[PDB]
Each structure stands twice: as structure tokens, then as C-alpha cells.
Amino acid sequence: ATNKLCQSFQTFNICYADTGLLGAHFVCDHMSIDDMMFVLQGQWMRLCTSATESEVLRGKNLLRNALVSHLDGTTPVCEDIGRSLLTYGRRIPLAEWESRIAEVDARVVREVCSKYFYDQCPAVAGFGPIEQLPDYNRIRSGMFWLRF
């Protein structure tokens, strides 16, 4: 926001059966792609190596709030029933989600993130004025820190 790096971004975690896509999408100025990548990958590394209790508490609280208010009215609830039965084999009640969320502390976020993010080869897709979009080797080297 302060440096006007991007116009937008989101983290995602797309789930499929035995696999998925965990990362982020961003839309930015043609001169900002390298900087966006650097800050984004920097965040991945910081969570892997050194996530704090209070910020994980914030993340927990976001997620608690996210899935409690998404299931508002009959359509989203109907869909949650429909798809949960396909994917999990059951509807997972909100009380169970809460138990899984309370279980997560700073130590967990580190260990879990390090599994999927740290020193792992990503998939990159770029479209548009992508002259700046970092070289794959530079992106891949951006998946570790020389300290931890």
C-alpha cells in the first residue's frame, strides 16, 4: 500500500484430491513485479522461520471470523453441505473447525509453512507486461534464507 507496489493481491490455497495450489496472485505495475515477488516471498520465509504468537492469533481470529460469516444464509450453507460430503465425506461442524484453529500456535505455523513453502520449487504463471517478472532461478532462490 505505502509503496504502491501492486493494485491487488491475494493468498489462496486451492485444494484438489491428493494435491493443490498454495500461494498468491498479484496484479501490478510493470515496474513493480520484482518488488512484489520479493516482499511476498519474504513473507513466506518470515512465517516459515519466525512467525510470532500474536500474529498467528490474528490469523486464527481472521479464519474463525472468515468461515463463520461466510456461512450466512441458505445458499452458502447448502453448498458447504454438498461439497463437504464429496471432499471430506461429512460436514465438519463449526465447533470442530474451532478446535483445529485453537490447536494452531506460532510453532505450528512455522512447522506447517516450512513443510510446503521452505526450499520448495514453485509453479509460476505470468501474463501481460512481464519483462520484470523475476527469472525462475531467482524466484527459486527466493524460497530460502541463508540464516535459518
Ligand X SMILES: CCCCCC(=O)OC[C@H](COP(=O)([O-])OCCN)OC(=O)CCCCC
Q: Site residues (CB under 6 A) for ligand X?
A: 141-142, 144-146
Helix (H, G, I), strand (E, B) or coil at 137: helix
Residue 42 beta carbon to ligand X: minimum distance, rounded to whole angstroms: 10
Residue that is written with C-alpha cell 521452505 in the block:
118
Q: Do 137 and 37 form a contact (C-beta atoms < 8 A)? A: no
Q: How far is CA 112 from CA 1, 13, 63, in A?
A: 28, 13, 16
Which one of another protein, ligand X, none interacts with residue 135, CB within 5 to 8 A by kind?
another protein
**DSSP structural state of residue 93:** P
Residue 142 beta carbon to ligand X: minimum distance, rounded to whole angstroms: 6
Identify which of residues 125 and 146 has a Cβ nearer to ligand X in the complex: 146
Tell me, residue by residue from 106 to 145, as one string, x for binding to another protein by CB under 8 A and - for no binding.
-----------------------------xxx--------
Identify which of residues 43 and 101 has a Cβ nearer to ligand X in the complex: 43
Phi/psi class of residue 13: alpha, beta or left (left: φ > 0; alpha: ψ in -120 to 50)?
A: left
* Chain positions contacting another protein, by CB under 8 A: 135-137
